[PDB]
Paper text:
Previous analysis of the crystal structure of E. coli CueO has highlighted that it adopts a canonical architecture consisting of three similar cupredoxin-like domains linked by peptides.
In the present work, we report the crystal structure of G304K at a resolution of 1.49 Å. When we examined the mutant protein crystal, we found no evidence of a Cu ion at the corresponding site in the structure. Because of the bulky side chain and positive charge of the Lys residue in G304K mutant, the R-loop could be significantly repelled out of the hydrophobic pocket that is mainly formed by the MR helix. In contrast, the placement of the C-terminal part (residues 308–314) of the R-loop was almost not changed. Similar to most of the reported crystal structures of CueO, the loop (residues 370–398) near T1 Cu atom is disordered in the G304K structure, suggesting that it is flexible.
Residue numbers in the entry: 30 to 372, 399 to 516
The structure:
Amino acid sequence: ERPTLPIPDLLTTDARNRIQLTIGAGQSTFGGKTATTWGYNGNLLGPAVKLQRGKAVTVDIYNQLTEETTLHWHGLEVPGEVDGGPQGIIPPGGKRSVTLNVDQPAATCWFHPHQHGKTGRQVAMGLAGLVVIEDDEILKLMLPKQWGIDDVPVIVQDKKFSADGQIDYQLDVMTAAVGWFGDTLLTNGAIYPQHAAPRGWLRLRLLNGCNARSLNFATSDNRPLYVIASDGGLLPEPVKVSELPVLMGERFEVLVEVNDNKPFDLVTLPVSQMKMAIAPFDKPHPVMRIQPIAISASGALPDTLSSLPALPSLEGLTVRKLQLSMDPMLDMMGMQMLMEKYGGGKFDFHHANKINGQAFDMNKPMFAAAKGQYERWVISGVGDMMLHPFHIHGTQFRILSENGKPPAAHRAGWKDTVKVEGNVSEVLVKFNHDAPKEHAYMAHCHLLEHEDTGMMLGFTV
Ligand SMILES: [Cu+2]
Ligand SMILES: [Cu+2]
Ligand SMILES: [Cu+2]
C-alpha cells in the first residue's frame, strides 16, 4: 500500500540539440481523491534537465495552460534573457525557446514558474522541475550516480487540499502575511513513498519545494547525513550532520549509509517559524521510507570533493543595502492567526510587502550591479520576526553572515539563498552575465506569497 517513490525523467538533448518542455494541466490522486494539477511533461512536477558544463542546449517550452506563465531557472548563472523578463512571459498556446550556456560547477538546480503576483499559486498547482549540472570534476569522484537507483531526487512539498480533494490555494490577506502552508506532505508528488536502495551509499538530492514552510531533514534512527553539496554545488569536503535545515527553494545533496536489511525513514523535524511549530509539523514527520535491497552499489564518498576559492578582501567592494519590510498589519494579523492555531482605510495587500520601502515594480529596476566583480549585499529583516529566505538570480554567492553569524560549514560554499529572520545577512555576489532592463534579474524573498505581494526587486547587470 506504500507507493513507490516517483523518479523524474532525466532528460538530455535529442539529435537536434533540443529538449522539449510542455506546461499543462492534468489530474493527480492524493489520498484517494483526485485533484486538478499542473506539470511539466506530465500531470505534476516535472523532469530533470541534464546540462553539461561548457556545452549548449536549447529548451523548447510550450505553454498549454489557459493562463500566462514564465520559467525561472533557479540557481543557473545565465544571462537575464534566459528567464526573459517581459519577453519571458509565455502566453497560453505560446512557445518560447531558450539556449542555455552552462558555465558553473556541477550542482542540482531547479526550475519553476515566476509570473509576478502568481508564483505561489502556479507552484502550488504543481509546477516544478530539476536541473542536473554535471562537469568533469564531479564525475571523477565516483559518487553514487545511477539515477533513480542510488542517486535520487527528493522534492519535498506541502499542500493544502479542500474536502473534495482539490488543491486549496488562495492569495488572501492571511496567506500574503504568513505564506501558503498545507497539512499534507508530498515527496516527488506522492504521500510517504518508499524507495528501494542498494547496500552502500545512497545519494539524495533534496529540494525544499514548499511555498512557505522551512524543513529540517533527519533519519528515523538518527543515522547521520553526509552533506556533499549545497545550492551551487559541491562542498570542499563532506560535512556530517544529524539534522539538516533546508529553506524554501534550497537544495542540498546528502549521502546516507544503507548498511543492512533494516528499513529506515527520511523525516523532517519541527521548525519554529516565528517561534511556533504547528501540527502536524510539531513532531517528526516521515518524508519517505528507504527499503534496503540485497544488491550492493559501488558509489564512493572521498575525503575531498572540490576546491572553493578563497574569499577576496572586502576592502573596496561595493556595498548594497536591502531592507526587507512586511506591512505591520499583515505582520500583526499573521502573529495572531498563528497564536490561535498554535494554542476601514483602502488597504491593498498586493503591494504591501517591500524592499527599501518599495513594492516590486517590474518597470523600474532598483539599481545596476557590476558585471564580473564581487559585491557585498547586506539584507536586513530587523523589522519583523518572519523567515525570509532571500534569493538572488544570476549568481551562486558566498554567505559572509547568515542572519547575524558566519555560516555553518555546510552553508559556507556556493549558495543562492540566505536566511534572513529578524537579523541581518551579508553575501558576496558576482554576476558573470548581462541582464538589461528588458531582461532584468530579480532578488527576492522565496517565501512565495511575500514575493507575490511586493518583496522583490529588479536589478540590471
Ligand atoms: Cu526559485
Ligand atoms: Cu519573506
Ligand atoms: Cu526568483
